[PDB]
């Protein structure tokens, strides 16, 4: 399979209530492996997956240091962002960063990422070439100029093609019992009468890992995109995910409808019906 490692930063200012909170979470695919919170009793990088516990004391020290330094970094960023946008110091604001790498089944860099947002809006993004930037506005162009001057993309690029992929390769081998196991969905169709004239067919998928999945309804082999209610994939709490697609159908017509499921853990896509 193909795999990814991501670090997610959120820095949230809270005027009147102390210094901005800084949170970091690390993921391999849909599995959190590490966390850091500046609001913790004695803030450090903490393991969240058994396969990372492995790494020795120096790992944990070096990673904690990175997060303590970045706490200061993103706090400066927030102050700077206020100035660039001519904002008051009374309001609460949020900076987010995502960064990491995708690898293909042979474990070679498929692509790298480095993206920041300010207040839920695009701010700056490293382009896919790992050489140039996209600033969303004139504020973000100031950062771009600073980062261009300091040759930041070159540094990210060395990281993304180097340590990002090396560590993910190590994580994947250590956590291979879970990271490299796909769990197929457990699927069924339920039947809930709405009225004399109408019924809900609900197509369930349970117990699947990773999160990616396609669930569609067809009436007479035609996709029912507009006529389907599709819930967001939600976590179950045991590493697995859940989803359902629902269609309201006329009474007596349940057999014209088929549920289609695609998931990595399935050798071929599935077709289900209401089986009374």
């Amino acid at each position: 399979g193909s795999h990814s490692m991501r670090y997610f930063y959120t820095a949230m200012s809270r005027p009147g209530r102390g210094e901005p909170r800084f949170i970091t979470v690390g993921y391999v695919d849909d599995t959190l492996f590490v966390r850091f919170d500046s609001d913790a009793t004695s803030p450090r990088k903490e393991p969240r997956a058994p396969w990372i516990e492995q790494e020795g004391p120096e790992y944990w020290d070096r990673e904690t240091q990175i997060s303590k330094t970045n706490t200061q970094t993103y706090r400066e960023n927030l102050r700077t962002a206020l100035r660039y946008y001519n904002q008051s110091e009374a309001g609460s604001h949020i900076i987010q960063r995502m960064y990491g790498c995708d690898v293909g089944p042979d474990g070679r860099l498929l692509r790298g990422y480095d993206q920041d947002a300010y207040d839920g809006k695009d701010y700056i993004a490293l382009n896919e070439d790992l050489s140039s930037w996209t600033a969303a506005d004139t504020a973000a162009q100031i950062t771009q100029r600073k980062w261009e001057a300091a040759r930041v993309a070159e540094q990210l690029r060395a990281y993304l093609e180097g340590l990002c992929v090396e560590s993910l390769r190590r994580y994947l081998e250590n956590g291979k019992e879970t990271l490299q196991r796909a769990d197929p969905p457990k699927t069924h169709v339920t039947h809930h009468p709405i009225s004399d004239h109408e019924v809900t067919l609900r197509c369930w998928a349970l117990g699947f890992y990773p999160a990616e999945i396609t669930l569609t309804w067809q009436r007479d082999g035609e996709d029912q995109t507009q006529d389907t209610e599709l819930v967001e994939t939600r976590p179950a709490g045991d590493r697995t995910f859940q989803k359902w697609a629902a269609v309201v159908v006329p009474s007596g017509e349940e057999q014209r409808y088929t549920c289609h499921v695609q998931h990595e853990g399935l050798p071929k896509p599935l077709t289900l019906r209401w089986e009374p």
Binding site: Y7, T24, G26, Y59, E63, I66, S67, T69, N70, T73, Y74, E76, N77, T80, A81, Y84, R97, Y99, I142, T143, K146, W147, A150, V152, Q155, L156, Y159, L163, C164, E166, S167
Partner: peptide, 9 residues
């Protein structure tokens, strides 16, 4: 594993 540096805005 994270990268050493981050840079300010």
């Amino acid at each position: 594993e994270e990268y050493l540096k981050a840079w300010t805005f």
